[PDB]
């Protein structure tokens, strides 16, 4: 149970870090008036990024 | 010039953010998608635009939403050419120097958030979000975008939400 | 200018696509070989040109065929120099900006597919295939070719076959 | 005189109580602290003043709150010298006799609660909270304060909340 | 004529349905009792009339309430004589033919619900609740009452709530 709790805490911390990284990545992925941001996704490749 | 700037801002669909009959800010459509300062509460003065669901961006205290293409027909034109000099906006001129925008004191106050900054060609170069008292002038906290598409927010130390 | 553009389009052998007595589109000869929009049905208004067998290209919804050299004598002149500005075509002017061609609303409709876009020198820079309502203007779906010979088709989202 | 009274009431920071776009009453700042009739619902027409937390006083159906000293700079001036005669307020004159304030019929109605009563020097002598039909005139229910600082509320029998 | 119709509608106590400062419809008093379209939300622009409790009638999407006799003094006069021809209402004339009311296109829109239809004598013959685009004209969905007292609602197929 101790090992399971430690693993759960690790998973939660990893999820929180991933969410914060996604927020930080979406920070340049805001409107940034062009209505077109292929290149930020192509460079950072944080997640669900450039099709090409 | 200021007359032409106001005429261009009015002809282009721009709508203040009304709350209980009070103008608490402004929002505009640039590049075919609506943007709104997150710190300003209320709804856009356009029922059709109000129907659009916005997404939040805490880092810059700004929101964005998709605008229908038919309404994307006539929006603000953005440019990345931002040389030093003077630009025009709703409350007159703005001085650009050292990468920062500054206006004379007494220009700008709470409720002016959302007013864009236009060049001599009427193209948007920055969006005014706030400001801070700077003696004989005041320095505005603005966001500008380079030719590489990087969003950069310039915020003076202890800047007030104007 | 529009008068000269129409005179050049008429003097150069161009023929609408007739079907049951109705003009459903247009086809022209550029670079000495005939092209035809695949979505438009019917036969070219030229018995000699109709004798030419066409090949299909589903990806761009366009067809092409070989034209006899003696008839290659006088065809459209293509150029790759496509700077921003305004160009001319059958139904007036066209604005080129951000790599896209746009014309004022009410210009262009079903049956205009195939009309080329001419520069100040009368050289073809693009071919109009369709369009989509864009408020005060409309954006045309066109194909253009760079100096490297790459075929690029610009198609607005949910563009209608015009 | 009424013109000067309205000018003094407007120059001094006074704000109606807005609820759903309807004026349901009025509130003012006298002696450097805000007062509001408890029976009137809504918020003061001033975001800065609305930030102040009020305390309740059921006995008089009135509320009060502390105003910042910088905003205490310019408030109503109260006086205890209340001789018999006539005074002025927003809707004209008021007759003071036998310790009671009376105005001609047809003057005052639901939504006028909070209007102060001014003397010839522009000093507040009473606050109007309600009234009751009195034939050719109407008698207002008001609160007044003596030189000893005693709060006295004069309420006609079966007075209506106006 | 339209001037006299507007004067009669204004002199008779009629009040729009205000919600957040926006006119979303209209309500009137006919035969000494108030009626209101159920689909329109908000409160009547009359505090005294707003005090009246309404009853719902889902079948016709209409509400009704009792009006005090003293206020029943001056209400709309209804008549059952509805011959074919033309009548008058707030936005001009209305054509009555085949038992249906029709008006020219561009007349009437969302927010006009509740406007009565008057005859040459100023008597109410129908109440406008909605409409539907009918090409060069538009057909209004109305309710009318025969000399036997039967409530009949005429609703075009796929009629829109106007």
Author numbering:
A (entry chain F): 372 to 423
B (entry chain J), C (entry chain L), D (entry chain I), E (entry chain K): 114 to 275
What does the paper say about this structure?
LDLRAD3 is a recently defined attachment and entry receptor for Venezuelan equine encephalitis virus (VEEV), a New World alphavirus that causes severe neurological disease in humans. The E2 and E1 proteins facilitate binding to entry factors and subsequent membrane fusion.
Single-particle analysis with imposed icosahedral symmetry yielded reconstructions at resolutions of 4.2 Å and 4.3 Å for the apo and complexed structures, respectively. Mature E2–E1 heterodimers assemble into trimeric spikes at the plasma membrane before budding and release of the virion from the host cell. Local resolution estimation performed in RELION revealed heterogenous resolution; the capsid proteins and membrane proximal regions of the E2–E1 heterodimers were best resolved (about 4 Å) and the membrane distal regions and LDLRAD3(D1) were less-well resolved (about 5–6 Å).
